[PDB]
């Protein structure tokens, strides 16, 4: 019973290299860890499954230590539950819907809030049972429009999803903080450089959601940190405050200027030799009040934050931009020619805009701008709000330090749900005093298969994968030279048995001479095995084995009599 | 602490079999919809214990664990032909791009696709891949709780070989691994021969948990190793010779005589002197074949289909087809003046002076004798065995038992590799279509099967390997500080020594009687009761799940005592 390369290192051919463009995808294919079945659907090959199980074990251990109870819920779920929550329609096209042979309707679960709520309303009948936290490690399906980046944006993927139930907000906060702490322990034990960040929870301010990110150059998410405080937020959530302390004095009188073929900030800047920080962008969106429009204004060098925009009560959520036809009907001028002066719709300006002076804006007259605009003198200041994305070097909104923007891969997300589900689905328990209480809920998700890829995105070199110690699929590769020779065979097999008996996970390279030593060595490093031992006649003659670490440049001789001492020391 | 206030969800017209009843009542599972169940905390613990044992034995047999997707592209199923052929149990769907998929009921096509990409050298063979993975089968009437669900957990393995001998070695290894699995799960089980789709041969076996509720009949020789499911079990006659003709054949009017019972009762004939004639579709398009068994016997539809002359799968001729071919209807058929091909059962060949429908409506021949009145047709084994029949290997007699199928193994030949073009060059450079086996265990079914076999009036009896916890701590008044500290200490010591402990932490509103009944329902094999009185006398109160009476252990020797009980 040896684990052998002839079995574990399968063919990686009929893989078009154009098809893998991020390093984790390339290396998971080349290392024989995953194989594509179809768009966003991958098999875990024997080597890759070993890594997945190590992630799952650590996640389960830390969920258990935090007092959560493991369950396992079905993938296929009745549409009727999804209609109770409203997500049957609202979830959108990522929900995979189907019908069974009796014409009954179902989805494949992308997540399990409705199922666990249905469970709770049947299983939780007393306050003495609360608080409680249920979790599973289970395969989800989300019909991502363009599955890509290997495991990072698959359609079928493994999630640890937990759901907690409470009679009060304070109770929820306690579990939520416990889940945050458990996540920190998980990503620490997985040997990943990671950060928790504040995330959007569907309103201005507050702290009802956090994300956990693996730091990596390829990460799709912008995450924001103070260089001096513990402030940390994804860019959707990060609060923007102005660099300026006050509004500058007006130095220019307002004038109406002809600006043909001037429909972008760049054209205005280049065309009229304006600093970009003296220009504004006026974006028109649908109002929450049906049939109304709202103008949202940011400085010309800033971007509208669509989450912040939507979260304004006056602005419809989700965010909908006005069409050119709607804008022209409302204002009598088109995109490129809009601004706050003589604007016949409501307006909200960014904090930085409120402090601008002598600024340029579309005149709400086609192909004209006002220059030298000043608040109060030329028009009243409208409502002010935080509307923009932060940018590198902005002030930290807690007043401590300046902001830096890094890239992250989202591997965890936790949420406070209040009574969103318990109200919709009638989940209530009587308090100790005998009052009906709609249960207050949290939910907590880790992208378990994503974590595997994220680890590689963060940890790789020119020779292939670098695993954190907790993730390596094997600890030791034995590379016998001439394993067919009786002396090498028996010494190699003896070494395998001694190491395995000490609890080490060992892979034996049993491949014949058509695989050169050089290829074998490169294979073991590509897969990311942290240690190798080479066995040869020459070494045995001198009573040595040849050792090399994955992160060592040179091999070293290992006296056979110090095997366990030497190797135990390396694996600590 | 693992505590009852969290775990215990112990508390139904749809629940008719005992395992289903008890899994609900013990808070192990909860129904979401038809054939869809959630594993509750206590139940999941049992499932994981099954999975661990299965994984251990698969790994020891040299199989490599993988994990394949549930959603599978239709194109692979079209290659094998099972996109259509699997039938309505295949759950078919379309994604947002209108591409077609199924949810996997099994994974032959996916693993074959993997193999044609991953296996390119004879040096890689033989190889055996397996997964423990949730399947979906759209069972027309999901029932029996976990036994016939729609979503269920299967361990499925698939082996690849360059020769039949190589397959046989792995197949035998899987058979042996299965034996170890069900032995370690503490189940009383038997392996049996199963249908392979031809007469004779040994390319399929099933593993059954013996249980009174078992849907499957399985057959054993009392004196030999012979073991087969009823589909597969070979039938041989009890008689050694055909009797001499003592009666002349004669045509008899027999109105309202369309069953064996009407003929036996109506005309006072022994049932062993009557025959049933069943008309089925021939393999040759548009033809019919008559299959004949003795009146006390039943046609085995697997044996019938496996006859080369008979279309497979088996299709029975309609009344209209029968009337058109023969000129009489069901109830009036037989082998005399029969204008279609006929095959008779081994037992029928030995009959004499027998009665048969005349192939004339409402008439029978009596006094029929082979050779004299008509030629003997082809003879075959067509009937089901019955209790007390001769063992077909000549050694002993057969007994029939009821089984729950929990495992099934198959030799597939090149069925998939030919259709999907899976081939590897031999050492000689000749392309070889890979010869395949597959091996399945119904992991979630096993949990229910265990209870079907092992239960009593107080609830579940788990095999030691399956029990969700080893010890229940039942403090009588846990609010009492002396009790709380002693119990908590006990929990810590026990847990520290590696034992799995449930602490009943529930308040006074739950009587000690209910606590005891709950721990027995859920099947925990050992309890320790902690009372202040007991602690004052330096004694704890122990009881095994299968014991009649509790006993008083000295508070000091509990650890040695418990350790011994759990060291077997
Ligand atoms: N395509 C994809 N491929 C691979 N891994 C993916 C992982 C996620 C993922 C992971 C963690 C949390 C979330 S979430 O933020 O959506 N939150 C919830 O689902 C909540 C918490 C748990 C109960 N419901 C999504 C999403 C994807 F799309 C993936
Ligand atoms: N409804 C149901 N509920 C719960 N458990 C069920 C279990 C099975 C089951 C178990 C073992 C083998 C088989 S099989 O004989 O079909 N063989 C194959 O699938 C082969 C071997 C493995 C690769 N393919 C079916 C079938 C069901 F329908 C179930």
mmCIF file with all atom_site columns, N, CA and C in Angstrom, chain A residues 207-262:
data_model
loop_
_atom_site.group_PDB
_atom_site.id
_atom_site.type_symbol
_atom_site.label_atom_id
_atom_site.label_alt_id
_atom_site.label_comp_id
_atom_site.label_asym_id
_atom_site.label_entity_id
_atom_site.label_seq_id
_atom_site.pdbx_PDB_ins_code
_atom_site.Cartn_x
_atom_site.Cartn_y
_atom_site.Cartn_z
_atom_site.occupancy
_atom_site.B_iso_or_equiv
_atom_site.pdbx_formal_charge
_atom_site.auth_seq_id
_atom_site.auth_comp_id
_atom_site.auth_asym_id
_atom_site.auth_atom_id
_atom_site.pdbx_PDB_model_num
ATOM 1   N N  . UNK A 1 207 ? -22.160 48.044 10.629  1.00 0.00 ? 207 UNK A N  1
ATOM 2   C CA . UNK A 1 207 ? -21.065 47.089 10.677  1.00 0.00 ? 207 UNK A CA 1
ATOM 3   C C  . UNK A 1 207 ? -21.600 45.662 10.654  1.00 0.00 ? 207 UNK A C  1
ATOM 4   N N  . UNK A 1 208 ? -22.687 45.467 9.899   1.00 0.00 ? 208 UNK A N  1
ATOM 5   C CA . UNK A 1 208 ? -23.385 44.194 9.868   1.00 0.00 ? 208 UNK A CA 1
ATOM 6   C C  . UNK A 1 208 ? -22.801 43.187 8.875   1.00 0.00 ? 208 UNK A C  1
ATOM 7   N N  . UNK A 1 209 ? -21.677 43.495 8.223   1.00 0.00 ? 209 UNK A N  1
ATOM 8   C CA . UNK A 1 209 ? -21.099 42.542 7.286   1.00 0.00 ? 209 UNK A CA 1
ATOM 9   C C  . UNK A 1 209 ? -19.589 42.730 7.218   1.00 0.00 ? 209 UNK A C  1
ATOM 10  N N  . UNK A 1 210 ? -18.846 41.609 7.163   1.00 0.00 ? 210 UNK A N  1
ATOM 11  C CA . UNK A 1 210 ? -17.405 41.638 6.977   1.00 0.00 ? 210 UNK A CA 1
ATOM 12  C C  . UNK A 1 210 ? -17.003 40.606 5.932   1.00 0.00 ? 210 UNK A C  1
ATOM 13  N N  . UNK A 1 211 ? -15.934 40.901 5.187   1.00 0.00 ? 211 UNK A N  1
ATOM 14  C CA . UNK A 1 211 ? -15.341 39.951 4.255   1.00 0.00 ? 211 UNK A CA 1
ATOM 15  C C  . UNK A 1 211 ? -13.956 39.562 4.765   1.00 0.00 ? 211 UNK A C  1
ATOM 16  N N  . UNK A 1 212 ? -13.521 38.340 4.433   1.00 0.00 ? 212 UNK A N  1
ATOM 17  C CA . UNK A 1 212 ? -12.147 37.923 4.646   1.00 0.00 ? 212 UNK A CA 1
ATOM 18  C C  . UNK A 1 212 ? -11.500 37.724 3.279   1.00 0.00 ? 212 UNK A C  1
ATOM 19  N N  . UNK A 1 213 ? -10.325 38.337 3.098   1.00 0.00 ? 213 UNK A N  1
ATOM 20  C CA . UNK A 1 213 ? -9.619  38.339 1.832   1.00 0.00 ? 213 UNK A CA 1
ATOM 21  C C  . UNK A 1 213 ? -8.225  37.746 2.002   1.00 0.00 ? 213 UNK A C  1
ATOM 22  N N  . UNK A 1 214 ? -7.834  36.918 1.034   1.00 0.00 ? 214 UNK A N  1
ATOM 23  C CA . UNK A 1 214 ? -6.448  36.542 0.846   1.00 0.00 ? 214 UNK A CA 1
ATOM 24  C C  . UNK A 1 214 ? -5.782  37.642 0.019   1.00 0.00 ? 214 UNK A C  1
ATOM 25  N N  . UNK A 1 215 ? -4.675  38.198 0.526   1.00 0.00 ? 215 UNK A N  1
ATOM 26  C CA . UNK A 1 215 ? -3.936  39.213 -0.212  1.00 0.00 ? 215 UNK A CA 1
ATOM 27  C C  . UNK A 1 215 ? -3.222  38.565 -1.394  1.00 0.00 ? 215 UNK A C  1
ATOM 28  N N  . UNK A 1 216 ? -3.490  39.073 -2.606  1.00 0.00 ? 216 UNK A N  1
ATOM 29  C CA . UNK A 1 216 ? -2.816  38.590 -3.799  1.00 0.00 ? 216 UNK A CA 1
ATOM 30  C C  . UNK A 1 216 ? -2.896  39.645 -4.898  1.00 0.00 ? 216 UNK A C  1
ATOM 31  N N  . UNK A 1 217 ? -1.831  39.719 -5.704  1.00 0.00 ? 217 UNK A N  1
ATOM 32  C CA . UNK A 1 217 ? -1.736  40.683 -6.793  1.00 0.00 ? 217 UNK A CA 1
ATOM 33  C C  . UNK A 1 217 ? -2.859  40.507 -7.815  1.00 0.00 ? 217 UNK A C  1
ATOM 34  N N  . UNK A 1 218 ? -3.367  39.273 -8.001  1.00 0.00 ? 218 UNK A N  1
ATOM 35  C CA . UNK A 1 218 ? -4.399  38.997 -8.996  1.00 0.00 ? 218 UNK A CA 1
ATOM 36  C C  . UNK A 1 218 ? -5.812  39.204 -8.463  1.00 0.00 ? 218 UNK A C  1
ATOM 37  N N  . UNK A 1 219 ? -5.949  39.522 -7.174  1.00 0.00 ? 219 UNK A N  1
ATOM 38  C CA . UNK A 1 219 ? -7.263  39.628 -6.562  1.00 0.00 ? 219 UNK A CA 1
ATOM 39  C C  . UNK A 1 219 ? -8.156  40.637 -7.285  1.00 0.00 ? 219 UNK A C  1
ATOM 40  N N  . UNK A 1 220 ? -9.436  40.281 -7.466  1.00 0.00 ? 220 UNK A N  1
ATOM 41  C CA . UNK A 1 220 ? -10.383 41.113 -8.197  1.00 0.00 ? 220 UNK A CA 1
ATOM 42  C C  . UNK A 1 220 ? -10.970 42.225 -7.333  1.00 0.00 ? 220 UNK A C  1
ATOM 43  N N  . UNK A 1 221 ? -10.841 42.105 -6.008  1.00 0.00 ? 221 UNK A N  1
ATOM 44  C CA . UNK A 1 221 ? -11.482 43.017 -5.088  1.00 0.00 ? 221 UNK A CA 1
ATOM 45  C C  . UNK A 1 221 ? -10.461 44.049 -4.614  1.00 0.00 ? 221 UNK A C  1
ATOM 46  N N  . UNK A 1 222 ? -10.839 45.328 -4.682  1.00 0.00 ? 222 UNK A N  1
ATOM 47  C CA . UNK A 1 222 ? -10.076 46.394 -4.052  1.00 0.00 ? 222 UNK A CA 1
ATOM 48  C C  . UNK A 1 222 ? -10.478 46.481 -2.585  1.00 0.00 ? 222 UNK A C  1
ATOM 49  N N  . UNK A 1 223 ? -9.472  46.406 -1.708  1.00 0.00 ? 223 UNK A N  1
ATOM 50  C CA . UNK A 1 223 ? -9.659  46.458 -0.275  1.00 0.00 ? 223 UNK A CA 1
ATOM 51  C C  . UNK A 1 223 ? -8.769  47.571 0.278   1.00 0.00 ? 223 UNK A C  1
ATOM 52  N N  . UNK A 1 224 ? -9.300  48.261 1.285   1.00 0.00 ? 224 UNK A N  1
ATOM 53  C CA . UNK A 1 224 ? -8.773  49.552 1.690   1.00 0.00 ? 224 UNK A CA 1
ATOM 54  C C  . UNK A 1 224 ? -8.331  49.462 3.141   1.00 0.00 ? 224 UNK A C  1
ATOM 55  N N  . UNK A 1 225 ? -7.120  49.960 3.416   1.00 0.00 ? 225 UNK A N  1
ATOM 56  C CA . UNK A 1 225 ? -6.554  49.971 4.753   1.00 0.00 ? 225 UNK A CA 1
ATOM 57  C C  . UNK A 1 225 ? -5.981  51.346 5.095   1.00 0.00 ? 225 UNK A C  1
ATOM 58  N N  . UNK A 1 226 ? -6.100  51.732 6.365   1.00 0.00 ? 226 UNK A N  1
ATOM 59  C CA . UNK A 1 226 ? -5.311  52.828 6.904   1.00 0.00 ? 226 UNK A CA 1
ATOM 60  C C  . UNK A 1 226 ? -3.877  52.367 7.088   1.00 0.00 ? 226 UNK A C  1
ATOM 61  N N  . UNK A 1 227 ? -2.925  53.262 6.827   1.00 0.00 ? 227 UNK A N  1
ATOM 62  C CA . UNK A 1 227 ? -1.530  52.947 7.068   1.00 0.00 ? 227 UNK A CA 1
ATOM 63  C C  . UNK A 1 227 ? -1.180  53.122 8.548   1.00 0.00 ? 227 UNK A C  1
ATOM 64  N N  . UNK A 1 228 ? -2.133  53.562 9.390   1.00 0.00 ? 228 UNK A N  1
ATOM 65  C CA . UNK A 1 228 ? -1.838  53.886 10.783  1.00 0.00 ? 228 UNK A CA 1
ATOM 66  C C  . UNK A 1 228 ? -2.836  53.297 11.782  1.00 0.00 ? 228 UNK A C  1
ATOM 67  N N  . UNK A 1 229 ? -4.003  52.823 11.332  1.00 0.00 ? 229 UNK A N  1
ATOM 68  C CA . UNK A 1 229 ? -5.021  52.319 12.236  1.00 0.00 ? 229 UNK A CA 1
ATOM 69  C C  . UNK A 1 229 ? -5.448  50.928 11.776  1.00 0.00 ? 229 UNK A C  1
ATOM 70  N N  . UNK A 1 230 ? -6.440  50.361 12.476  1.00 0.00 ? 230 UNK A N  1
ATOM 71  C CA . UNK A 1 230 ? -7.017  49.068 12.134  1.00 0.00 ? 230 UNK A CA 1
ATOM 72  C C  . UNK A 1 230 ? -8.162  49.220 11.135  1.00 0.00 ? 230 UNK A C  1
ATOM 73  N N  . UNK A 1 231 ? -8.332  50.423 10.579  1.00 0.00 ? 231 UNK A N  1
ATOM 74  C CA . UNK A 1 231 ? -9.373  50.656 9.590   1.00 0.00 ? 231 UNK A CA 1
ATOM 75  C C  . UNK A 1 231 ? -9.151  49.761 8.374   1.00 0.00 ? 231 UNK A C  1
ATOM 76  N N  . UNK A 1 232 ? -10.194 49.013 8.007   1.00 0.00 ? 232 UNK A N  1
ATOM 77  C CA . UNK A 1 232 ? -10.124 48.102 6.871   1.00 0.00 ? 232 UNK A CA 1
ATOM 78  C C  . UNK A 1 232 ? -11.525 47.906 6.292   1.00 0.00 ? 232 UNK A C  1
ATOM 79  N N  . UNK A 1 233 ? -11.671 48.147 4.986   1.00 0.00 ? 233 UNK A N  1
ATOM 80  C CA . UNK A 1 233 ? -12.972 48.072 4.331   1.00 0.00 ? 233 UNK A CA 1
ATOM 81  C C  . UNK A 1 233 ? -12.775 47.745 2.856   1.00 0.00 ? 233 UNK A C  1
ATOM 82  N N  . UNK A 1 234 ? -13.695 46.968 2.271   1.00 0.00 ? 234 UNK A N  1
ATOM 83  C CA . UNK A 1 234 ? -13.662 46.838 0.826   1.00 0.00 ? 234 UNK A CA 1
ATOM 84  C C  . UNK A 1 234 ? -14.053 48.207 0.267   1.00 0.00 ? 234 UNK A C  1
ATOM 85  N N  . UNK A 1 235 ? -13.684 48.451 -0.987  1.00 0.00 ? 235 UNK A N  1
ATOM 86  C CA . UNK A 1 235 ? -13.863 49.758 -1.605  1.00 0.00 ? 235 UNK A CA 1
ATOM 87  C C  . UNK A 1 235 ? -15.347 50.114 -1.724  1.00 0.00 ? 235 UNK A C  1
ATOM 88  N N  . UNK A 1 236 ? -16.237 49.110 -1.816  1.00 0.00 ? 236 UNK A N  1
ATOM 89  C CA . UNK A 1 236 ? -17.673 49.372 -1.789  1.00 0.00 ? 236 UNK A CA 1
ATOM 90  C C  . UNK A 1 236 ? -18.094 50.085 -0.503  1.00 0.00 ? 236 UNK A C  1
ATOM 91  N N  . UNK A 1 237 ? -17.480 49.704 0.619   1.00 0.00 ? 237 UNK A N  1
ATOM 92  C CA . UNK A 1 237 ? -17.889 50.140 1.941   1.00 0.00 ? 237 UNK A CA 1
ATOM 93  C C  . UNK A 1 237 ? -17.030 51.305 2.442   1.00 0.00 ? 237 UNK A C  1
ATOM 94  N N  . UNK A 1 238 ? -15.788 51.447 1.962   1.00 0.00 ? 238 UNK A N  1
ATOM 95  C CA . UNK A 1 238 ? -14.849 52.373 2.591   1.00 0.00 ? 238 UNK A CA 1
ATOM 96  C C  . UNK A 1 238 ? -15.373 53.814 2.534   1.00 0.00 ? 238 UNK A C  1
ATOM 97  N N  . UNK A 1 239 ? -15.452 54.462 3.702   1.00 0.00 ? 239 UNK A N  1
ATOM 98  C CA . UNK A 1 239 ? -15.934 55.834 3.793   1.00 0.00 ? 239 UNK A CA 1
ATOM 99  C C  . UNK A 1 239 ? -14.880 56.790 3.223   1.00 0.00 ? 239 UNK A C  1
ATOM 100 N N  . UNK A 1 240 ? -15.356 57.716 2.372   1.00 0.00 ? 240 UNK A N  1
ATOM 101 C CA . UNK A 1 240 ? -14.543 58.765 1.784   1.00 0.00 ? 240 UNK A CA 1
ATOM 102 C C  . UNK A 1 240 ? -14.808 60.085 2.497   1.00 0.00 ? 240 UNK A C  1
ATOM 103 N N  . UNK A 1 241 ? -13.720 60.754 2.892   1.00 0.00 ? 241 UNK A N  1
ATOM 104 C CA . UNK A 1 241 ? -13.773 62.095 3.450   1.00 0.00 ? 241 UNK A CA 1
ATOM 105 C C  . UNK A 1 241 ? -12.854 62.990 2.620   1.00 0.00 ? 241 UNK A C  1
ATOM 106 N N  . UNK A 1 242 ? -13.121 64.310 2.517   1.00 0.00 ? 242 UNK A N  1
ATOM 107 C CA . UNK A 1 242 ? -12.282 65.165 1.682   1.00 0.00 ? 242 UNK A CA 1
ATOM 108 C C  . UNK A 1 242 ? -10.872 65.378 2.232   1.00 0.00 ? 242 UNK A C  1
ATOM 109 N N  . UNK A 1 243 ? -9.918  65.613 1.324   1.00 0.00 ? 243 UNK A N  1
ATOM 110 C CA . UNK A 1 243 ? -8.566  66.006 1.697   1.00 0.00 ? 243 UNK A CA 1
ATOM 111 C C  . UNK A 1 243 ? -8.539  67.469 2.130   1.00 0.00 ? 243 UNK A C  1
ATOM 112 N N  . UNK A 1 244 ? -9.416  68.291 1.542   1.00 0.00 ? 244 UNK A N  1
ATOM 113 C CA . UNK A 1 244 ? -9.530  69.700 1.883   1.00 0.00 ? 244 UNK A CA 1
ATOM 114 C C  . UNK A 1 244 ? -10.308 69.841 3.192   1.00 0.00 ? 244 UNK A C  1
ATOM 115 N N  . UNK A 1 245 ? -9.927  70.835 4.002   1.00 0.00 ? 245 UNK A N  1
ATOM 116 C CA . UNK A 1 245 ? -10.553 71.074 5.292   1.00 0.00 ? 245 UNK A CA 1
ATOM 117 C C  . UNK A 1 245 ? -11.741 72.024 5.157   1.00 0.00 ? 245 UNK A C  1
ATOM 118 N N  . UNK A 1 246 ? -11.736 72.864 4.109   1.00 0.00 ? 246 UNK A N  1
ATOM 119 C CA . UNK A 1 246 ? -12.775 73.866 3.928   1.00 0.00 ? 246 UNK A CA 1
ATOM 120 C C  . UNK A 1 246 ? -12.879 74.252 2.453   1.00 0.00 ? 246 UNK A C  1
ATOM 121 N N  . UNK A 1 247 ? -13.945 74.988 2.136   1.00 0.00 ? 247 UNK A N  1
ATOM 122 C CA . UNK A 1 247 ? -14.176 75.506 0.796   1.00 0.00 ? 247 UNK A CA 1
ATOM 123 C C  . UNK A 1 247 ? -13.324 76.756 0.580   1.00 0.00 ? 247 UNK A C  1
ATOM 124 N N  . UNK A 1 248 ? -12.592 76.801 -0.538  1.00 0.00 ? 248 UNK A N  1
ATOM 125 C CA . UNK A 1 248 ? -11.767 77.947 -0.871  1.00 0.00 ? 248 UNK A CA 1
ATOM 126 C C  . UNK A 1 248 ? -12.593 79.148 -1.337  1.00 0.00 ? 248 UNK A C  1
ATOM 127 N N  . UNK A 1 249 ? -11.997 80.331 -1.202  1.00 0.00 ? 249 UNK A N  1
ATOM 128 C CA . UNK A 1 249 ? -12.595 81.583 -1.612  1.00 0.00 ? 249 UNK A CA 1
ATOM 129 C C  . UNK A 1 249 ? -12.870 81.556 -3.113  1.00 0.00 ? 249 UNK A C  1
ATOM 130 N N  . UNK A 1 250 ? -13.959 82.202 -3.538  1.00 0.00 ? 250 UNK A N  1
ATOM 131 C CA . UNK A 1 250 ? -14.235 82.382 -4.956  1.00 0.00 ? 250 UNK A CA 1
ATOM 132 C C  . UNK A 1 250 ? -13.301 83.443 -5.544  1.00 0.00 ? 250 UNK A C  1
ATOM 133 N N  . UNK A 1 251 ? -12.595 83.078 -6.617  1.00 0.00 ? 251 UNK A N  1
ATOM 134 C CA . UNK A 1 251 ? -11.664 83.966 -7.300  1.00 0.00 ? 251 UNK A CA 1
ATOM 135 C C  . UNK A 1 251 ? -12.127 84.297 -8.721  1.00 0.00 ? 251 UNK A C  1
ATOM 136 N N  . UNK A 1 252 ? -13.119 83.561 -9.248  1.00 0.00 ? 252 UNK A N  1
ATOM 137 C CA . UNK A 1 252 ? -13.598 83.753 -10.614 1.00 0.00 ? 252 UNK A CA 1
ATOM 138 C C  . UNK A 1 252 ? -15.099 84.013 -10.596 1.00 0.00 ? 252 UNK A C  1
ATOM 139 N N  . UNK A 1 253 ? -15.566 84.832 -11.540 1.00 0.00 ? 253 UNK A N  1
ATOM 140 C CA . UNK A 1 253 ? -16.987 85.040 -11.730 1.00 0.00 ? 253 UNK A CA 1
ATOM 141 C C  . UNK A 1 253 ? -17.487 83.947 -12.661 1.00 0.00 ? 253 UNK A C  1
ATOM 142 N N  . UNK A 1 254 ? -18.732 83.512 -12.471 1.00 0.00 ? 254 UNK A N  1
ATOM 143 C CA . UNK A 1 254 ? -19.250 82.427 -13.285 1.00 0.00 ? 254 UNK A CA 1
ATOM 144 C C  . UNK A 1 254 ? -19.484 82.928 -14.713 1.00 0.00 ? 254 UNK A C  1
ATOM 145 N N  . UNK A 1 255 ? -19.106 82.122 -15.715 1.00 0.00 ? 255 UNK A N  1
ATOM 146 C CA . UNK A 1 255 ? -19.340 82.474 -17.108 1.00 0.00 ? 255 UNK A CA 1
ATOM 147 C C  . UNK A 1 255 ? -19.818 81.262 -17.900 1.00 0.00 ? 255 UNK A C  1
ATOM 148 N N  . UNK A 1 256 ? -20.694 81.539 -18.866 1.00 0.00 ? 256 UNK A N  1
ATOM 149 C CA . UNK A 1 256 ? -21.202 80.521 -19.771 1.00 0.00 ? 256 UNK A CA 1
ATOM 150 C C  . UNK A 1 256 ? -20.282 80.429 -20.980 1.00 0.00 ? 256 UNK A C  1
ATOM 151 N N  . UNK A 1 257 ? -19.843 79.209 -21.289 1.00 0.00 ? 257 UNK A N  1
ATOM 152 C CA . UNK A 1 257 ? -18.837 78.958 -22.300 1.00 0.00 ? 257 UNK A CA 1
ATOM 153 C C  . UNK A 1 257 ? -19.324 77.897 -23.283 1.00 0.00 ? 257 UNK A C  1
ATOM 154 N N  . UNK A 1 258 ? -19.009 78.105 -24.570 1.00 0.00 ? 258 UNK A N  1
ATOM 155 C CA . UNK A 1 258 ? -19.286 77.147 -25.629 1.00 0.00 ? 258 UNK A CA 1
ATOM 156 C C  . UNK A 1 258 ? -18.297 75.985 -25.596 1.00 0.00 ? 258 UNK A C  1
ATOM 157 N N  . UNK A 1 259 ? -18.836 74.756 -25.529 1.00 0.00 ? 259 UNK A N  1
ATOM 158 C CA . UNK A 1 259 ? -18.017 73.561 -25.392 1.00 0.00 ? 259 UNK A CA 1
ATOM 159 C C  . UNK A 1 259 ? -18.518 72.465 -26.327 1.00 0.00 ? 259 UNK A C  1
ATOM 160 N N  . UNK A 1 260 ? -18.506 72.690 -27.662 1.00 0.00 ? 260 UNK A N  1
ATOM 161 C CA . UNK A 1 260 ? -18.830 71.624 -28.614 1.00 0.00 ? 260 UNK A CA 1
ATOM 162 C C  . UNK A 1 260 ? -17.837 70.467 -28.514 1.00 0.00 ? 260 UNK A C  1
ATOM 163 N N  . UNK A 1 261 ? -18.329 69.252 -28.781 1.00 0.00 ? 261 UNK A N  1
ATOM 164 C CA . UNK A 1 261 ? -17.514 68.049 -28.776 1.00 0.00 ? 261 UNK A CA 1
ATOM 165 C C  . UNK A 1 261 ? -16.775 67.917 -27.444 1.00 0.00 ? 261 UNK A C  1
ATOM 166 N N  . UNK A 1 262 ? -17.451 68.285 -26.349 1.00 0.00 ? 262 UNK A N  1
ATOM 167 C CA . UNK A 1 262 ? -16.883 68.220 -25.011 1.00 0.00 ? 262 UNK A CA 1
ATOM 168 C C  . UNK A 1 262 ? -17.832 67.414 -24.128 1.00 0.00 ? 262 UNK A C  1
#
